[PDB]
Design an enzyme around this catalytic site. Sequence first.
Site, mmCIF file in Angstrom:
data_model
loop_
_atom_site.group_PDB
_atom_site.id
_atom_site.type_symbol
_atom_site.label_atom_id
_atom_site.label_comp_id
_atom_site.label_asym_id
_atom_site.label_seq_id
_atom_site.Cartn_x
_atom_site.Cartn_y
_atom_site.Cartn_z
ATOM 1 N N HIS B 41 0.804 -1.213 0.000
ATOM 2 C CA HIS B 41 0.000 0.000 0.000
ATOM 3 C C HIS B 41 0.854 1.289 0.000
ATOM 4 O O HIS B 41 0.286 2.370 0.064
ATOM 5 C CB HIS B 41 -1.074 0.026 1.098
ATOM 6 C CG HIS B 41 -0.567 0.177 2.495
ATOM 7 N ND1 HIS B 41 -0.627 -0.867 3.390
ATOM 8 C CD2 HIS B 41 -0.073 1.265 3.126
ATOM 9 C CE1 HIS B 41 -0.133 -0.394 4.520
ATOM 10 N NE2 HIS B 41 0.210 0.883 4.408
ATOM 11 N N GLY B 143 2.570 6.295 9.499
ATOM 12 C CA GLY B 143 3.997 6.290 9.197
ATOM 13 C C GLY B 143 4.725 5.058 9.730
ATOM 14 O O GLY B 143 5.863 4.798 9.327
ATOM 15 N N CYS B 145 3.753 1.856 9.270
ATOM 16 C CA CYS B 145 3.607 0.726 8.364
ATOM 17 C C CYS B 145 4.970 0.270 7.839
ATOM 18 O O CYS B 145 5.829 1.096 7.568
ATOM 19 C CB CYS B 145 2.638 1.040 7.229
ATOM 20 S SG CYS B 145 0.977 1.513 7.776
HETATM 21 C C1 LSF Z 1 -2.972 5.215 10.234
HETATM 22 C C2 LSF Z 1 -2.287 4.002 10.806
HETATM 23 C C3 LSF Z 1 -2.041 3.907 12.172
HETATM 24 C C4 LSF Z 1 -1.478 2.756 12.686
HETATM 25 N N1 LSF Z 1 -1.136 1.700 11.937
HETATM 26 C C5 LSF Z 1 -1.353 1.786 10.619
HETATM 27 C C6 LSF Z 1 -1.927 2.900 10.006
HETATM 28 N N2 LSF Z 1 -2.219 2.913 8.624
HETATM 29 C C7 LSF Z 1 -3.293 2.322 8.063
HETATM 30 O O1 LSF Z 1 -4.154 1.734 8.712
HETATM 31 C C8 LSF Z 1 -3.362 2.442 6.552
HETATM 32 C C9 LSF Z 1 -4.171 1.328 5.925
HETATM 33 C C10 LSF Z 1 -3.546 0.263 5.289
HETATM 34 C C11 LSF Z 1 -4.277 -0.827 4.840
HETATM 35 C C12 LSF Z 1 -5.649 -0.870 5.022
HETATM 36 C C13 LSF Z 1 -6.275 0.193 5.654
HETATM 37 O O2 LSF Z 1 -7.602 0.176 6.020
HETATM 38 C C14 LSF Z 1 -7.778 -0.343 7.351
HETATM 39 C C15 LSF Z 1 -8.658 -1.588 7.204
HETATM 40 C C16 LSF Z 1 -9.577 -0.888 8.192
HETATM 41 O O3 LSF Z 1 -10.574 -1.203 8.836
HETATM 42 N N3 LSF Z 1 -8.884 0.262 8.114
HETATM 43 C C17 LSF Z 1 -5.554 1.300 6.074
#
Ligand code: LSF
Lengths: 304, 304
Positions: B41, B143, B145
């Site tokens: 992603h 950030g 990820c």
């Molecule tokens: C912002 C953040 C904070 C902490 N850890 C990760 C993130 N980033 C994301 O979550 C981006 C992302 C990547 C894949 C899928 C996606 O949708 C999810 C699936 C659902 O329910 N929401 C979102």
Amino acid sequence: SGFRKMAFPSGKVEGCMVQVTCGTTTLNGLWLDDVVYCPRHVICTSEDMLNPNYEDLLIRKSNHNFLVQAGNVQLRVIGHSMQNCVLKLKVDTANPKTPKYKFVRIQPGQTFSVLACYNGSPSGVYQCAMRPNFTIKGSFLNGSCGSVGFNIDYDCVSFCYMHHMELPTGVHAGTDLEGNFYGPFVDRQTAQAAGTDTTITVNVLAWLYAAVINGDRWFLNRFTTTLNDFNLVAMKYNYEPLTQDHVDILGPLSAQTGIAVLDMCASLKELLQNGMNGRTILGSALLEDEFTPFDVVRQCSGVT
Amino acid sequence: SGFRKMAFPSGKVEGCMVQVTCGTTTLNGLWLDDVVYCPRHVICTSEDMLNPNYEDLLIRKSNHNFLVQAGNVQLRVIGHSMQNCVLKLKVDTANPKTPKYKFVRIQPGQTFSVLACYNGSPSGVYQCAMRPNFTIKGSFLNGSCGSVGFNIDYDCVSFCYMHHMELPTGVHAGTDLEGNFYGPFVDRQTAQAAGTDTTITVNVLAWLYAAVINGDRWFLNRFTTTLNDFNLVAMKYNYEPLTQDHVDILGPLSAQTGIAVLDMCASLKELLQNGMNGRTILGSALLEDEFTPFDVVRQCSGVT
Ligand SMILES: Cc1ccncc1NC(=O)Cc1cccc(O[C@@H]2CC(=O)N2)c1
Ligand SMILES: Cc1ccncc1NC(=O)Cc1cccc(O[C@@H]2CC(=O)N2)c1
């Protein structure tokens, strides 16, 4: 989101861990520049630990008696000296992996990461706090002495603790990197009991702010209090008295959440008086006091 | 003595963290040999995340569009490919700090350390467990990820997790290093809810053994139980059913303490039925399930 007892990355400190052997005793040392720091009780036998005269014991020790090994390679010891409760072994090679570093003596209530080591090798890393009674609640076994506590600011490692002993109560005592013990403890196998372990109020409040930021808000109530009123409650529950300096340090968290410090104190007061009622806060069934207001801001903003 | 949620030393993994930028998105990558692994992603915009067609999105991307930076130096990308939900960026330089490593897909209930990173820089390390519903309860911000989960055996790093997403519930989902998600989660900004989070019974029992070894014995009772009887209780409290394989893995802890596994199950049963009654176990007011029987043995023996 999410909130974890997070330690600093330990790599800069792993590059400093060595093994120090003196006679039959082996413990950990910290190699920075051409100096290896370790607990002075490395020169003691189990019999010596009852009433050790470190100046007399050190007389019978020469540079060649201190075996220093970094990984598989032996360091040549060209000098030795005692500074309070640490020995400083001057080696002929500067540690090529020495990071930017400082020796800092921390205040009670402040937190730090510990890299537990055995035979100069790191086994694990965890986050600790210097308790108000100057002990730490760590995880240390025989051979762990010389393991260090530290904080990292960008690229600078501030060494703040060196592990020396375990009290009969299972709590841990040690020194700063100048060899001065935190608290009244001495490096002697004698009866030493820790004082009252009080709760670090400013850290509990900072953790309550972290909980609000992360979604756990059930504990927020319709009340407020004053510093004097809150402290009457804090005294009854063996909590550190909250000062205006504490309120001031909680300012950025108060500004971020929009919840006044005294309002959060009233939430804490009701939590102290009524308990959790079977509920949890940030996956914990008790009030956590090992996150400073700085740790909360750092974790919630992602400072690397 | 003492018992802490201890993570592995993170140095071997810090030496692998890089920053990957694609267009306007920046996340973390894992540099091992001449390959940089990161979440796919990275190629998406916020609009793309609603319904991304990763094969179509990748068509519009060339080797020069993936900016890989290790510290202050830029890596030259000579190849790119998608493997499930990870991108593999072939760089022209092998990472000189690559440790001995494996890619392992862990089982639910198993634990691992996470090195949270932002912009390719490590901010902290903490110990996690793969929940029975295949989520992790971590601490991750935007950030983060590409941050990885791992275990260390002597000098070999077993990479087991790569962080991809946060669910609306504040829990975290991600993949193994082959890009396969743990659980049913997809890398799409769509409604995804986690299943029932059950408690890892074998880990709670292992932590009860750690408590006995460390002095906390109040919960030991005069009772015993059977696997079937214990599991009736475990079902009522959303605990994983205990199997003979679990009893077998608890064998070394049972041998060390001299407390039979089914006797410890009876202690757990009374703890589930009656609660802690205001008491704590290893400084915790709830039953901890993020220490495997291996973690307890490791921590209580000092494996470096
Ligand atoms: C912002 C953040 C904070 C902490 N850890 C990760 C993130 N980033 C994301 O979550 C981006 C992302 C990547 C894949 C899928 C996606 O949708 C999810 C699936 C659902 O329910 N929401 C979102
Ligand atoms: C075995 C172990 C496990 C974990 N962490 C440390 C150790 N080692 C020691 O404690 C050795 C030692 C060094 C100085 C003083 C001393 O006596 C203390 C003072 C008191 O009450 N007992 C003992």
